[PDB]
Amino acid sequence: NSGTLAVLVHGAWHSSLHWAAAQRGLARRGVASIAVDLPGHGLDAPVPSGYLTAGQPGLETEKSALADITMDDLADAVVDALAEVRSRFARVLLVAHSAGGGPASLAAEKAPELVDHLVYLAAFVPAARPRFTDYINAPENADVVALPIFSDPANLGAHRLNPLSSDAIEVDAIRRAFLTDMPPDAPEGWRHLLHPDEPYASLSAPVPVTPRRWGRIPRTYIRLDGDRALAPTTQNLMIAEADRLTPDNPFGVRSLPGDHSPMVHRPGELADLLAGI
Amino acid sequence: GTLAVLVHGAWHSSLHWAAAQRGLARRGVASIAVDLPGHGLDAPVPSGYLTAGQPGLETEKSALADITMDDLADAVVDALAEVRSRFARVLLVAHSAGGGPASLAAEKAPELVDHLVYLAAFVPAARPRFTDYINAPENADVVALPIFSDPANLGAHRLNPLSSDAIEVDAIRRAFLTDMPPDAPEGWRHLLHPDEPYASLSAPVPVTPRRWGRIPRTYIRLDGDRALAPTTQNLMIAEADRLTPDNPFGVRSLPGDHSPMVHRPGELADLLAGI
């Protein structure tokens, strides 16, 4: 693991900060790691003009500043990060979580030489269906906790969530979807560490990958069996459908118990898993 | 085989190092960022912090009231102990109030640090409390932070970047992010934490010249700092060097504001990689 680097790509509404504890776990095994902040996430992220204002005026109608972000912009940010570290490490592992699988996969398609192994952590695999919504709305995913995404995401230019809502039922839906295994008396800092706007392209734009570029990279899926945001059945569906398109290079399959956020609630064993890939 | 362990400052978290971490990887320097107790995803919020009008924010006792300076330092030691056998060279980089816990951690376990970097950070060698330097005459020129009154009774030094008073919010911006472009996004406002543990700025940090004082160390002064005066940074350097005449500070510099890992992450990473 002396020359292995894990490039971590966060999921929708999250950022690089959610990987922090898992990065500590990886270092404990001598695995260096960096976390990419996709456009619209991290310290650079915007918020709607009323998101931090009492009453939250205009939140349901204001157009998002992320409306013009394309799927290629998200992938090219991953390509840029992979390109900056390629000459420094012999083995580069691309680790994507949830919606990050789109941009990570397209980056591996654009530049397969920059990626030595793909790791999908309950993430979107665009091999068989190019849009994440193609799986989110599939019958296998009907039993997940329905996220309170704002109506008409195409017009806002983003899939909008409101963890700062005064509606405790609304906030509790986000809580149960992402952080199901959270202790009953846990701190509430996570509420203002999420970003409200996820670019429309992230969940709704097609991600075209081919079996002769993306499909030849060694890859592993990590299924989260207690996932209430993306059903384990949907995760198995993505593994089976993608494998049928690359029969000579099938998915490696690992498994963890618990909710959609093992980097938060199981960072130690997630790092141990990643170091074993 | 070099690992940089990054300790954030007050009201911040590991998140703010992200751009500098990517810059360090460019140069082949691995890095992790520690989240001190009460920061990051572990951070609590007052019950009214996210409520319209923020009721009770001025009086509610903090959940961080019982965190001691030893708790903050022991978290740094625990992080340093996990990576010691995996890297030949461990750089402990502290920013601002992070210098307190990082220095006490280095004093508790000197074999876990090969070099200390103080990035406009508190150096407790000559004065054990950060307020000994914050309230020094050399620091009178900083942008006054709108910290809530009576931090001892609250159990925290409280900041309110979510305040409806634009002047209050702008004072936080002018102190930490003076060089912010004119039309920058607002995300930074909700990525700060309101409560900094009372011990962070007020508790004494005891280090000795034969433990902490023997570790190679560097200070990175920020010349356009409006949160911690550059004069205060030079004073900390000089006063600390008198107590360790055999091991004086290495002194480097960066222009710009108090947040170089936000506004100058490239040159900051070039500096750290060259240490």
Residue numbers in the entry:
A (entry chain A): 6 to 282
B (entry chain B): 8 to 282
Question: How did the manuscript describe this experimental structure?
Answer:
The BioC-aided methylation enables the resultant malonyl-ACP (CoA) methyl ester to undergo two reiterations of FAS II cycles, generating methyl pimeloyl-ACP thioester that is subsequently hydrolyzed by the promiscuous esterase BioH to give pimeloyl-ACP (pim-ACP or C7-ACP), a precursor for biotin synthesis. The enzymatic activity in vitro combined with biotin bioassay in vivo reveals that BioH2 and BioH3 are capable of removing methyl moiety from pimeloyl-ACP methyl ester to give pimeloyl-ACP, a cognate precursor for biotin synthesis.
The crystal belongs to the P21 space group, and contains six protein molecules per asymmetric unit (ASU). First, its core domain is of α/β-fold in nature, comprising of six parallel β-strands (β1–4 and β7–8), five α-helices (α1–3 and α10–11) and a short α9 turn. Apart from α-helices, the lid domain of BioH3 also contains two β-strands (β5–6) and several connecting linkers. Similar to the Shigella BioH with known complex structure, the PEG-loading cavity of BioH3 are mainly formed by the side chains of hydrophobic residues (e.g., W18, F137, and F183) from its core domain.
